[PDB]
Amino acid sequence: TNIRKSHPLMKIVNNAFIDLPAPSNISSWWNFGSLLGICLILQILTGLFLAMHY
Amino acid sequence: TNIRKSHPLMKIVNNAFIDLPAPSNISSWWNFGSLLGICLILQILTGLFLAMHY
Amino acid sequence: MLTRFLGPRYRQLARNWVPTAQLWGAVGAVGLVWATDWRLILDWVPYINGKFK
Amino acid sequence: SHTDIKVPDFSDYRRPEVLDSTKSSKESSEARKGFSYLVTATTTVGVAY
Amino acid sequence: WALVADLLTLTWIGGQPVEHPYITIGQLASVLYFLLILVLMPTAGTIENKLLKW
Amino acid sequence: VPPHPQDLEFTRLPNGLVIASLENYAPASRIGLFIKAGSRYENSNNLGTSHLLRLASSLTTKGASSFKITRGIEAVGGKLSVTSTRENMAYTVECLRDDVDILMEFLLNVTTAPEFRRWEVAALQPQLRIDKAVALQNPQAHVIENLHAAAYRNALANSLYCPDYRIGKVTPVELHDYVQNHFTSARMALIGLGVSHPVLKQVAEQFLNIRGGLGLSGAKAKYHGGEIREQNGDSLVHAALVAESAAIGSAEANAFSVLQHVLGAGPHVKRGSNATSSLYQAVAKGVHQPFDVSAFNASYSDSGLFGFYTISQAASAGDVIKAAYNQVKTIAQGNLSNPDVQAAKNKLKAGYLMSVESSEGFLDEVGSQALAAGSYTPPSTVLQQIDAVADADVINAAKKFVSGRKSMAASGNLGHTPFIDEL
Amino acid sequence: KAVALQNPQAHVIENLHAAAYRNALANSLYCPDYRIGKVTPVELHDYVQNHFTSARMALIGLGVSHPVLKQVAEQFLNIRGGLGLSGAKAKYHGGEIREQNGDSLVHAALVAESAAIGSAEANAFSVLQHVLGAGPHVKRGSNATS
Amino acid sequence: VSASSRWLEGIRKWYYNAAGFNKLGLMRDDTIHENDDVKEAIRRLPENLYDDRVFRIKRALDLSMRQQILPKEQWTKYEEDKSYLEPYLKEVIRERKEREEWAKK
Amino acid sequence: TATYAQALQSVPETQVSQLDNGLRVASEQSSQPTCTVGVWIDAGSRYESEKNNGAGYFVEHLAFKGTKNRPGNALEKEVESMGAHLNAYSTREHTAYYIKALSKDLPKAVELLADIVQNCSLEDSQIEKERDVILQELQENDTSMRDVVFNYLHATAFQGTPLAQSVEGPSENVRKLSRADLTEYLSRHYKAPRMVLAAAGGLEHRQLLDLAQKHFSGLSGTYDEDAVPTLSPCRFTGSQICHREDGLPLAHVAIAVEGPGWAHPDNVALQVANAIIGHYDCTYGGGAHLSSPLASIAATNKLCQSFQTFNICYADTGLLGAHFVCDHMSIDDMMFVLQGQWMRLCTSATESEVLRGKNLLRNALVSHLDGTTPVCEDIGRSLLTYGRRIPLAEWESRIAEVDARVVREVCSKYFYDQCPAVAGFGPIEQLPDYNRIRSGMFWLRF
Amino acid sequence: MLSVAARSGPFAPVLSATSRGVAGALRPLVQAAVPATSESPVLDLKRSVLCRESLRG
Ligand code: HEM
Ligand code: HEM
Ligand code: HEM
Ligand code: HEM
Numbered sequence A, B: 001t002n003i004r005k006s007h008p009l010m011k012i013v014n015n016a017f018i019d020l021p022a023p024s025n026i027s028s029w030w031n032f033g034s035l036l037g038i039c040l041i042l043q044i045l046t047g048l049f050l051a052m053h054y
Numbered sequence C: 001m002l003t004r005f006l007g008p009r010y011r012q013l014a015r016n017w018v019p020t021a022q023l024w025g026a027v028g029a030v031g032l033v034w035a036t037d038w039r040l041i042l043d044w045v046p047y048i049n050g051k052f053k
Numbered sequence D: 001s002h003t004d005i006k007v008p009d010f011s012d013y014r015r016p017e018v019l020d021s022t023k024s025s026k027e028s029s030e031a032r033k034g035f036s037y038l039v040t041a042t043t044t045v046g047v048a049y
Numbered sequence E: 001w002a003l004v005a006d007l008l009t010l011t012w013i014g015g016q017p018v019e020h021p022y023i024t025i026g027q028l029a030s031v032l033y034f035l036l037i038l039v040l041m042p043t044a045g046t047i048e049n050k051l052l053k054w
Numbered sequence F: 001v002p003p004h005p006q007d008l009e010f011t012r013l014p015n016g017l018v019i020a021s022l023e024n025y026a027p028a029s030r031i032g033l034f035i036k037a038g039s040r041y042e043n044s045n046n047l048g049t050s051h052l053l054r055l056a057s058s059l060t061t062k063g064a065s066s067f068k069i070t071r072g073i074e075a076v077g078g079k080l081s082v083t084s085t086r087e088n089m090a091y092t093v094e095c096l097r098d099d100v101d102i103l104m105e106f107l108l109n110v111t112t113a114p115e116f117r118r119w120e121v122a123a124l125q126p127q128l129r130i131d132k133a134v135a136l137q138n139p140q141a142h143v144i145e146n147l148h149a150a151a152y153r154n155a156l157a158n159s160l161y162c163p164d165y166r167i168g169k170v171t172p173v174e175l176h177d178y179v180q181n182h183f184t185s186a187r188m189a190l191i192g193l194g195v196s197h198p199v200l201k202q203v204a205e206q207f208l209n210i211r212g213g214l215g216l217s218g219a220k221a222k223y224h225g226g227e228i229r230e231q232n233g234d235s236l237v238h239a240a241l242v243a244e245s246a247a248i249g250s251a252e253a254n255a256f257s258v259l260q261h262v263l264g265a266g267p268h269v270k271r272g273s274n275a276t277s278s279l280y281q282a283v284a285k286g287v288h289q290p291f292d293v294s295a296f297n298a299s300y301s302d303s304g305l306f307g308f309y310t311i312s313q314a315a316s317a318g319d320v321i322k323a324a325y326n327q328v329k330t331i332a333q334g335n336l337s338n339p340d341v342q343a344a345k346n347k348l349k350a351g352y353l354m355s356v357e358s359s360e361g362f363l364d365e366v367g368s369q370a371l372a373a374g375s376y377t378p379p380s381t382v383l384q385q386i387d388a389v390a391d392a393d394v395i396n397a398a399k400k401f402v403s404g405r406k407s408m409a410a411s412g413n414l415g416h417t418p419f420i421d422e423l
Numbered sequence G: 001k002a003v004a005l006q007n008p009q010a011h012v013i014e015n016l017h018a019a020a021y022r023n024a025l026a027n028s029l030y031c032p033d034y035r036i037g038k039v040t041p042v043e044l045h046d047y048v049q050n051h052f053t054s055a056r057m058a059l060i061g062l063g064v065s066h067p068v069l070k071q072v073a074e075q076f077l078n079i080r081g082g083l084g085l086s087g088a089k090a091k092y093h094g095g096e097i098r099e100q101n102g103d104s105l106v107h108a109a110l111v112a113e114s115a116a117i118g119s120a121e122a123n124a125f126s127v128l129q130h131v132l133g134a135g136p137h138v139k140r141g142s143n144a145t146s
Numbered sequence H: 001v002s003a004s005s006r007w008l009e010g011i012r013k014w015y016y017n018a019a020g021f022n023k024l025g026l027m028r029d030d031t032i033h034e035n036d037d038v039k040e041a042i043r044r045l046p047e048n049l050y051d052d053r054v055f056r057i058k059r060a061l062d063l064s065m066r067q068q069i070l071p072k073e074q075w076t077k078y079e080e081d082k083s084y085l086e087p088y089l090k091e092v093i094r095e096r097k098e099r100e101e102w103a104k105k
Numbered sequence I: 001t002a003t004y005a006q007a008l009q010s011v012p013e014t015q016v017s018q019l020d021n022g023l024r025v026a027s028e029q030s031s032q033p034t035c036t037v038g039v040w041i042d043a044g045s046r047y048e049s050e051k052n053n054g055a056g057y058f059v060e061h062l063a064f065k066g067t068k069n070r071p072g073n074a075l076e077k078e079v080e081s082m083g084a085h086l087n088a089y090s091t092r093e094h095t096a097y098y099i100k101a102l103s104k105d106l107p108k109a110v111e112l113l114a115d116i117v118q119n120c121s122l123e124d125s126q127i128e129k130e131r132d133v134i135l136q137e138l139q140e141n142d143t144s145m146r147d148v149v150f151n152y153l154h155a156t157a158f159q160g161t162p163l164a165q166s167v168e169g170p171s172e173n174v175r176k177l178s179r180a181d182l183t184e185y186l187s188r189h190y191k192a193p194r195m196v197l198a199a200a201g202g203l204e205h206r207q208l209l210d211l212a213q214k215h216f217s218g219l220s221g222t223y224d225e226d227a228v229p230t231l232s233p234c235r236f237t238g239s240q241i242c243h244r245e246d247g248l249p250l251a252h253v254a255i256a257v258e259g260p261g262w263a264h265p266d267n268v269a270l271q272v273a274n275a276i277i278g279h280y281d282c283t284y285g286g287g288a289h290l291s292s293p294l295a296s297i298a299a300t301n302k303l304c305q306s307f308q309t310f311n312i313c314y315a316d317t318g319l320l321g322a323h324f325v326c327d328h329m330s331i332d333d334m335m336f337v338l339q340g341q342w343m344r345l346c347t348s349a350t351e352s353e354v355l356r357g358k359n360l361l362r363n364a365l366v367s368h369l370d371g372t373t374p375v376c377e378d379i380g381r382s383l384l385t386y387g388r389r390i391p392l393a394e395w396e397s398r399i400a401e402v403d404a405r406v407v408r409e410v411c412s413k414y415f416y417d418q419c420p421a422v423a424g425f426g427p428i429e430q431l432p433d434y435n436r437i438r439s440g441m442f443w444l445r446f
Numbered sequence J: 001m002l003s004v005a006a007r008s009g010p011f012a013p014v015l016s017a018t019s020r021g022v023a024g025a026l027r028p029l030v031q032a033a034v035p036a037t038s039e040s041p042v043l044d045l046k047r048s049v050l051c052r053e054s055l056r057g
């Protein structure tokens, strides 16, 4: 066995961003899901720093 | 098949609070885990309402 | 294409569940009424006249 | 030999309405569920409040 | 594409005062939005199926 | 005050089909289509085809999908069962009087318009393995299957259960071929119970006029002899010793049946010593503890296997077998009474009459008779035929067993089980 | 057992022996299916104690010296308390075993009792084997002398 | 038969060409959306058709990935477009509909 | 051609007649050349003490081993020589001894039955041989998981009552029961008003009567009086017995609510509902398409090897439920589906399925009453439990009256929110906890 | 007196839709349950005996 595949925490990562079987032909348009992911974190991070003075 | 056992969302619930095999002899002292759970939510809920005026 | 659920058995099914769907609605109503203190609906109930007039 | 398998006396734990081997349990069943469900009904009423 | 184009119209109108042109075009675009999604797009699918002998 | 009965009506159509019906004023009805299509008609290239076929009675037909057959029959609370022997396949269908019509239709559809769809047949293959495992938990089934494999080189040698290597390999085309060439008019019989002759005769003339298959009762079973031995460790050894006897229908067959009762078939008393059983008392005398024995008698269209079957602890096998064999020898040397043959005759007659007491037993006897003989022989004449058997006929059958080339099958821990050579 | 049994020859020869003898040589070189999982530690112990004894043994060496092997044998191989000779005696019986298969190819072996090894007759059989034909001598040959 | 039928046939041929699955060597039935009825029909296909169907889908997904298309001569021609799935799908639906009728009584 | 309905009327009325004893003699004359005669007795194990238990099972063993007029093996010799078959059984509530023989042989068959049922020779050497035989049978019955679970279910459902006992008794009783014990049990129970001579086939009722007076006259006449008790009711409990044994490869589970006794009219509606649920076995053809949803879901999802619903009847009580056999990881799904079906029927039973239930039941009734043997048994048992013979036409009428409303009312009464008796054996780690099985006996939807 | 299987002896399998798979002709067994130790499974990889589609009220 591996470490990625078996560890309770890493499993989740592995099954979602590493070994996840993805279609070979998805195009940009499929990128907006990860981009929303980034926008969500970007909104939270700059949002927190603003809350430190607002 | 059931509904609890198979549904992606309910599975998690089932595996954590319904069919979870638990030892038959745990005593009060084992309750503090759920009590911390309640305290965490209680702190968040009253905490939010205070933030609406603080 | 909901013509799948149209027939004698489904008609028998609907009836068997009516007293239950009706009693569930009575639960929902009184439950809504008692939880918001529905002035309009409550004032008619004999006791529970804790709003005097 | 599986015929030796006793069933331990539970008189020590049985509700009074179910103490006689001589008679039905069906009679006291309603009162018995009644009593136990009244407890949970009163409780929910309490929690609702 | 007419839905996306109709949504440009809607935002453009939305950013404009409720005076001349703007009222009736923004009124008709609203009808179009719902005529498109609710009636036109489905009808097209049925037609397309038919052209394919499906 | 019971109603005066009715006679069975019997009819051979010119195409060879036979129709027999009895109007018992019964609440239920029973219709069976008996066909000469048992495992003996299989060959080296298609073994197990009649097994999968037997398991395929509810697959879709023209005129009736699988779902319909199942739901339709269950809606009226009836049955559809297929039963096979090395010679026949019998499709029986059961239901109350008022429902004969729909059941008849499903029957005709299953037997004359099967579609054997690729995917439905693929899904059914695993059932052979479940079906075979369940039969094979009775040690008798292995034994008798090996007994036949050992005795014949041919057709009767085939098994009633699909060989393992064929599970998953029998094809839709092989099922189609098996039906087209065996399920034909000249190889068929439509028997009815609780129906009327015109109706069965109408049905047969409209739907059972199929012919273009093979012809008679065989390729001809060539009795050969030999032995099959299966090491097992079961604490109990099962063994069967047999020799060629006589084809069913012949006078000699009845002699063998009477011999079977002189020696001993099943028991008559719950937990009894089995006093009138020659074989049993003969083994018991010199063997102390767990054992069973019984004469065995199988009769077919062109052959027969008669002898005995023993069950015993691994170490007593030799003794049990030898005692049994010697007991038959004793009758072959003339040591047979007259009241013994008389008692055997009574056991045989009482049992046959008992065998057709019910609808299921009666219908099967009428169906098998129709196939084997093309006739219906009333209980009176069967009783008459049994009576014609003389003591010397029984003695002669025993003598035939003793000197005929033997066949034997045995399973268990065989360390003390003799080889024929040693009998 | 599965790996050995993928060569059709192994089934054949195992059944050939089962068919020919009623005894000891009839046994198979592979455990019967019904025994898999059932052979016990006590049965292994018993098999060793009664067969792995001095009078039934031979220590052969290659690239070693006689004194060393002889020393080893005198120190460690002096075990005896088992059975005695070469058998219960194989009683040749005869008969046939047939396994229906569908393999496109039929494998068959026809045999009769011949002679025990060591006897002069055994050599006659070995010469007969070569008159008739054992394996091939030429890659992809007609096998003229067979 | 005449002028009109050919006109509806040429309109159908026109849509077909416009639809563009042909450009990726696909056949119409390779584009069907997979619901249960369809999933079952795929299952019921014989070995050959099933294998051909996977190769076609693979050939297309590959093309679709690098956003290329097949040379014009290798496009599937309309009405040379074998509807291999149809008979299976039809029967699976027919089977479901019968279950559905029985479920009403 | 006659209709089904008409055919029910054609069945000859079972003739009932009483002796100056209490011995009821009943027969159903047919046209068959074979017949079945027997004696049904209101003696079982629900009548036994505790020390005593196994008494009748013990008598059954001795019954065919010698009488005073026919010693050691002489009886066997007579029965076998006429080609007849002699058999016997015993439940918790009934004992039977019956001969299956040629019609001419009726005189001898009754004569033998009489001799066996009265002049029994419980000879010391034989009663001593039988203790080894019965103990071996106990060892044998232990290997039958199914027989074990139904004995467990009885033992838990009927806890401190005589009904918790098995027919064969505990081993300690088998090795200690004396001849005195047996003789006393015989004296108490094998007496005229508690027995019924039953027959079926080619016999005229007068023959049976003559024979009954000829060979049974000599029982209860100068007898009865004080020492004849009735049957006390048996409290149903509602609990669980789990015999965990991971060594066995399939789990056996039997669950049941308390049913009403033999007498109750509502056994018909229960049998209809049970029929709707039906039975399954891995050798049934038709998997996915089976009508019964339990059967169908069990076959496709492979949730079991077999299952059967049942409705066992005793004096004023009974066990109503189901039994199943399955792999260790399927006990939970199996229970869920089983319980799901009971509630569905309790609340939402539909008409079409009720007709199927009624139809399955009409076929079962008639298919079973085929042959002199099942009918003779039916006559004997009926008279012991019903006091009458209930003609098929009446059973039909009772079946015909059942509609969906009745099913959901009658199932509700027995199943809805009631405590089951649960018995498990084998790999039962996944047998749901009792509280959860109890919570599956009602529904929050409803 | 035909009906090979009922003439007692040769084997006769039954398959069904609603009833159970039967394998059941004649050989000894019955007089081995008496001189006892004739075990049996209790539904080891099985089905079920006695079978069903018979009853009463
Ligand atoms: C916080 C807002 C959202 C986040 C973080 C989110 C995240 C994602 C991610 C990571 C994917 C997989 C990659 C991809 O196809 O882009 C995805 C696919 C999808 N999302 Fe979202 N998304 C969000 C809002 C939406 C919205 C607004 C909808 C439409 C109501 C939507 C419906 C879908 C669907 C149907 C898919 C499957 C698309 C496909 O596989 O072709 N999600 N999303
Ligand atoms: C929990 C993480 C977030 C925090 C702590 C946060 C906190 C704040 C604070 C303190 C302000 C006032 C300061 C300012 O106006 O610049 C603000 C403004 C705003 N935030 Fe957030 N926010 C968070 C996530 C979001 C999200 C998810 C959105 C939605 C995209 C969002 C959109 C806005 C907008 C539109 C404004 C007002 C426009 C402006 O920047 O002036 N922020 N936020
Ligand atoms: C937000 C704070 C915490 C939460 C919500 C939390 C929640 C829980 C819950 C729900 C359980 C299971 C039930 C029980 O035994 O109580 C548990 C068990 C446990 N927790 Fe925590 N806990 C928290 C803090 C801690 C701390 C501070 C520790 C010690 C560093 C700890 C170590 C453990 C361990 C070892 C167990 C296993 C105990 C056993 O099974 O005997 N957790 N916790
Ligand atoms: C995100 C959820 C929470 C929010 C929104 C929240 C918000 C607040 C706010 C606005 C105050 C100032 C008002 C006041 O002093 O009463 C406060 C005070 C405090 N909170 Fe929280 N809080 C949250 C969770 C917590 C947690 C997890 C703890 C740790 C148990 C906590 C412990 C405290 C304490 C000790 C005080 C000061 C004592 C006091 O009440 O005067 N709260 N919180």
Ligand SMILES: COC1=C(OC)C(=O)C(C/C=C(\C)CCC=C(C)C)=C(C)C1=O
Residues within 6 Å of the ligand: A016, A020, A021, A022, A023, A026, A030, A031, A033, A034, A037, A038, A040
């Ligand atoms: C195979 O299809 C997929 C992609 O290719 C189009 C993605 O790119 C992503 C990317 C998702 C990320 C990185 C998680 C972000 C979510 C949060 C809450 C931060 C997912 C899940 C996916 O399934």
Ligand SMILES: COC1=C(OC)C(=O)C(C/C=C(\C)CCC=C(C)C)=C(C)C1=O
Residues within 6 Å of the ligand: B016, B020, B021, B022, B023, B026, B030, B031, B033, B034, B037, B038, B040
């Ligand atoms: C078998 O042992 C366990 C218990 O018995 C002592 C519990 O009571 C709980 C209770 C935990 C809850 C309700 C989840 C709360 C967590 C959050 C973040 C709200 C868990 C998990 C458990 O494993």
